[PDB]
Amino acid sequence: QLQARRLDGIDYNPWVEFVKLASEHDVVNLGQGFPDFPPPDFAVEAFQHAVSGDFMLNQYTKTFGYPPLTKILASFFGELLGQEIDPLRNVLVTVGGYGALFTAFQALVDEGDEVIIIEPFFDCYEPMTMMAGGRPVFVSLKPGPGELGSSSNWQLDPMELAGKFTSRTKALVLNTPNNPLGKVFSREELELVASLCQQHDVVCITDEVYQWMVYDGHQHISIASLPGMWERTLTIGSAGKTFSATGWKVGWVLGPDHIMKHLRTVHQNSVFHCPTQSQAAVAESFEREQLLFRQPSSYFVQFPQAMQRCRDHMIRSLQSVGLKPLIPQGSYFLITDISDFKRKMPDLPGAVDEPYDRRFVKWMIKNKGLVAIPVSIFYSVPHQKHFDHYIRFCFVKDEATLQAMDEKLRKWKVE
Amino acid sequence: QLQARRLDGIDYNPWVEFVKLASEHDVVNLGQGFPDFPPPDFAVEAFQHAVSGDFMLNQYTKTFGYPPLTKILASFFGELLGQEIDPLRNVLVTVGGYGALFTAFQALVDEGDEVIIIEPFFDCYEPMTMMAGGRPVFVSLKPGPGELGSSSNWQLDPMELAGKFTSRTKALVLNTPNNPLGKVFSREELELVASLCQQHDVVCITDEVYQWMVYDGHQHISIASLPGMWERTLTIGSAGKTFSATGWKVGWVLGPDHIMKHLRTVHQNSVFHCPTQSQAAVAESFEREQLLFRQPSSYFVQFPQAMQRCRDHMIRSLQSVGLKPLIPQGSYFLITDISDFKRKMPDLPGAVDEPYDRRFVKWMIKNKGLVAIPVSIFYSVPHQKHFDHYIRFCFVKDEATLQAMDEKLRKWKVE
Ligand SMILES: *Cc1c(COP(=O)(O)O)cnc(C)c1O
Ligand SMILES: *Cc1c(COP(=O)(O)O)cnc(C)c1O
Ligand SMILES: N[C@@H](Cc1ccccc1)C(=O)O
Numbered sequence: 001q002l003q004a005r006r007l008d009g010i011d012y013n014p015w016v017e018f019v020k021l022a023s024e025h026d027v028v029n030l031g032q033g034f035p036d037f038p039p040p041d042f043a044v045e046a047f048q049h050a051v052s053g054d055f056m057l058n059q060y061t062k063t064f065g066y067p068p069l070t071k072i073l074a075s076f077f078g079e080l081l082g083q084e085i086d087p088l089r090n091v092l093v094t095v096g097g098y099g100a101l102f103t104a105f106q107a108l109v110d111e112g113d114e115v116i117i118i119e120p121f122f123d124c125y126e127p128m129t130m131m132a133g134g135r136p137v138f139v140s141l142k143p144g145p146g147e148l149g150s151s152s153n154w155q156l157d158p159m160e161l162a163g164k165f166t167s168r169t170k171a172l173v174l175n176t177p178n179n180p181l182g183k184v185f186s187r188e189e190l191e192l193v194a195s196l197c198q199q200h201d202v203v204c205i206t207d208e209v210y211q212w213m214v215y216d217g218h219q220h221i222s223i224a225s226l227p228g229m230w231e232r233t234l235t236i237g238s239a240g241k242t243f244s245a246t247g248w249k250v251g252w253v254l255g256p257d258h259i260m261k262h263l264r265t266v267h268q269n270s271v272f273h274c275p276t277q278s279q280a281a282v283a284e285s286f287e288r289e290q291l292l293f294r295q296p297s298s299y300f301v302q303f304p305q306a307m308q309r310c311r312d313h314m315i316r317s318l319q320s321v322g323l324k325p326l327i328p329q330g331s332y333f334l335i336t337d338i339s340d341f342k343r344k345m346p347d348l349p350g351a352v353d354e355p356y357d358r359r360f361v362k363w364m365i366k367n368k369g370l371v372a373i374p375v376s377i378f379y380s381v382p383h384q385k386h387f388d389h390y391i392r393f394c395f396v397k398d399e400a401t402l403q404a405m406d407e408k409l410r411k412w413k414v415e
Numbered sequence: 416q417l418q419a420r421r422l423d424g425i426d427y428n429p430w431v432e433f434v435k436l437a438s439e440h441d442v443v444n445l446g447q448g449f450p451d452f453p454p455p456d457f458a459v460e461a462f463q464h465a466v467s468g469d470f471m472l473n474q475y476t477k478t479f480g481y482p483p484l485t486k487i488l489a490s491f492f493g494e495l496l497g498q499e500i501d502p503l504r505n506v507l508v509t510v511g512g513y514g515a516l517f518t519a520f521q522a523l524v525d526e527g528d529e530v531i532i533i534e535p536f537f538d539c540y541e542p543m544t545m546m547a548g549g550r551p552v553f554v555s556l557k558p559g560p561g562e563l564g565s566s567s568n569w570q571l572d573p574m575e576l577a578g579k580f581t582s583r584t585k586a587l588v589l590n591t592p593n594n595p596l597g598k599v600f601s602r603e604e605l606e607l608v609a610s611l612c613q614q615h616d617v618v619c620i621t622d623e624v625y626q627w628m629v630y631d632g633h634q635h636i637s638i639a640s641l642p643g644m645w646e647r648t649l650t651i652g653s654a655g656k657t658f659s660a661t662g663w664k665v666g667w668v669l670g671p672d673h674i675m676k677h678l679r680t681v682h683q684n685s686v687f688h689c690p691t692q693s694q695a696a697v698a699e700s701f702e703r704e705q706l707l708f709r710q711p712s713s714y715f716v717q718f719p720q721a722m723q724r725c726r727d728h729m730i731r732s733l734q735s736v737g738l739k740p741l742i743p744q745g746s747y748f749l750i751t752d753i754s755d756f757k758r759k760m761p762d763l764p765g766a767v768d769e770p771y772d773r774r775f776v777k778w779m780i781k782n783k784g785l786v787a788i789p790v791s792i793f794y795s796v797p798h799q800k801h802f803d804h805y806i807r808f809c810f811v812k813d814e815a816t817l818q819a820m821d822e823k824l825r826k827w828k829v830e
């Protein structure tokens with residue numbers, strides 16, 4: 001009654017409960033979606049330059065983006081998407097990719113509108129939809145029929161997907177690479193999704209914050225570069241996952257003027273300006289990355305290789321301890337199947353109809369000194385019972401952390 | 416139809432049209448609500464320190480605030496308000512005071528709710544209310560019955576104010592010191608407002624971004640320090656107006672847990688984190704200001720004195736050219752009565768039923784080389800006809816700017 005109905009349901013945040021049980025133990029922390037090593041030197045230094053240069057950089061910049069940043073966004077992303085991107089009509093800088101999503105949802109989703117969300121989903125898609133009056137409509141990526149799995153075998157059933165569309169579908173949220181699965185959507189998969197979007201005339205909010213974290217030669221493709229798609233896609237990105245600087249909380253949306261003009265209204269009636277100096281640091285960091293595009297020494301080349309190594313490392317470590325990893329083609333994350341521990345150990349300390357993975361993650365934190373995130377926080381509530389056997393690890397870590405993890409894992413092994 | 420109804424009306428932004436007519440002339444810019452000199456050294460250096468210190472500061476901080484910043488906010492503001500402020504239950508760091516307002520409005524205002532807005536009002540109060548489904552209800556500060564006016568003579572008629580309250584009033588937006596008037600609400604005025612708020616059980620969103628810019632010995636008082644008021648006030652502030660660093664876009668809301676828990680839901684479903692390093696810079700800048708509280712050398716002492724000088728300077732300059740200044744007790748701004756020019760010059764190039772002040776500001780920009788902001792952008796549309804004779808100047812400026820202004824003003828004088 002004091003508060004607005006838009007807040008009904010969405011008030012519960014799984015984060016906080018867990019990342020507070022973590023702090024009351026000696027743990028190797030692998031549930032955190034951020035690096036624990038520094039950003040690359042050229043980007044820190046870019047921040048350093050923007051806070052020590054033209055003093056007017058301490059003041060307000062332009063409402064829809066710091067112009068050097070919208071310039072490099074238009075240019076680099078225009079080239080990657082193969083699109084004529086106008087910085088002033090097609091680019092909006094936002095408070096991280098999170099603020100970008102929020103802006104998008106507030107612009108487009110209204111009482112009645114359905115938003116197709118593909119599980120496992122970054123958890124905020126659902127509450128943001130709900131705050132906007134929409135009705136989430138879920139579809140599940142289903143794993144295919146070795147022993148170690150693969151993210152790319154998680155299938156988007158074409159018939160099941162097509163069935164989700166009604167005349168009330170406003171938007172489909174596509175997240176690639178996917179958090180927490182690490183699926184990198186194929187071209188065929190993208191075409192599938194594009195196909196229905198054109199057909200039913202539906203916007204595709206597409207969260208590509210992990211664009212650059214792709215492994216094993218898999219290729220990040222943007223649904224917006226697909227024929228006819230720009231006119232109906234919003235493409236979100238994040239400086240933080242791009243330059244390993246998550247506390248910079250800069251992101252952007254690219255998309256066509258007839259959509260973006262709504263995003264801009266929300267922006268101008270919510271935050272109005274983004275901080276100036278972060279924008280400057282990000283503009284200079286993209287400049288440095290475009291200069292060196294494809295090159296052995298570009299961050300978008302070395303970083304994925306390094307993190308591919310960390311991934312490979314984690315996969316091996318968790319495997320030999322009973323966990324069944326799903327090799328990701330991208331993102332910061334891999335998930336592991338715990339179905340074996342569920343048989344081995346079915347009753348665990350945990351509240352009433354708490355899904356297994358949640359009860360398991362608590363167990364592990366206490367006894368074995370390791371943080372993961374239960375995957376069920378990324379399923380609609382009705383699907384948590386069926387999808388309660390996965391947990392989510394972050395391998396974007398310092399080597400000292402992989403070391404400490406192995407220490408934890410060997411102490412475990414002796415059981 | 417593609418976009419959400421919450422965007423109806425609110426899409427028009429007076430800013431942009433004007434600050435683009437400005438850039439196509441040689442102008443002294445006085446419509447900008449930000450300094451054009453640097454922030455104080457200790458605050459720039461605080462930024463410099465947070466972007467070159469513990470590298471983990473490049474990563475995510477806590478959702479509701481960087482803890483060193485919520486610590487100093489609780490402590491300093493607790494002391495100023497005379498209130499026990501818990502950082503975790505009573506403080507939320509937001510994307511500037513703008514993001515704070517937005518958070519507040521999204522938390523509390525719902526279809527039906529009325530929000531009492533006092534004119535002249537910072538323009539966003541109205542559209543934010545509207546996006547939230549609310550119904551702005553207006554009241555006007557009316558100037559009293561010398562020749563030069565005074566902001567403190569603009570009166571909040573007690574009977575007129577009381578009449579605005581219905582059973583549908585959710586919130587009253589109090590802005591003190593006031594943008595664009597520079598009114599510093601008296602204690603009696605505050606008690607008036609408090610009185611009705613307690614009586615009708617209404618929240619008082621109170622925008623105190625100008626807290627420290629008070630002149631002539633006038634005292635900034637917070638409605639929240641008034642008896643019984645904390646339980647029903649939200650107090651917003653901004654690092655940018657506090658430390659002359661508007662592009663830092665850090666702000667906060669203080670208020671009681673039973674209200675703030677809603678602000679937090681909006682926050683966690685909108686931005687989730689604020690950038691880390693700005694927070695660090697602001698925490699250290701408050702630390703430096705509290706250390707030196709009241710002291711000759713504290714920024715909260717010298718800065719108001721300096722800006723009081725700039726104010727005094729502008730008042731004299733604009734006076735002798737026909738403009739009738741209203742001396743502000745606070746804020747960055749003074750407004751001047753142009754009623755004389757309206758008689759002197761009634762027909763001006765400007766669209767159809769454009770209020771006079773808007774047409775006047777355009778005229779001045781072209782011919783006389785000076786930027787102001789028409790005050791009518793801060794009145795409800797039905798009241799613009801009656802309140803079309805004021806324009807708004809920003810005196811928070813470098814001396815080189817006051818110089819150039821005088822140059823413009825003397826070239827003018829020869830007419
Ligand atoms: C981390 C993450 C975000 C948030 O990006 P920020 O720049 O931190 O706002 C958005 N989407 C996904 C899928 C993420 O993993
Ligand atoms: C400038 C201003 C704001 C905005 O504060 P930011 O920290 O820039 O968000 C809010 N309210 C008033 C009355 C202002 O003048
Ligand atoms: N996305 C990262 C971090 C994050 C958490 C909550 C909001 C935004 C980003 C994760 O899944 O751990």
Ligand SMILES: N[C@@H](Cc1ccccc1)C(=O)O
Nearest residue numbers: 272430446447448449513594
């Ligand atoms: N508040 C200042 C600057 C500002 C403009 C628009 C949004 C937020 C802050 C002004 O009135 O000029």
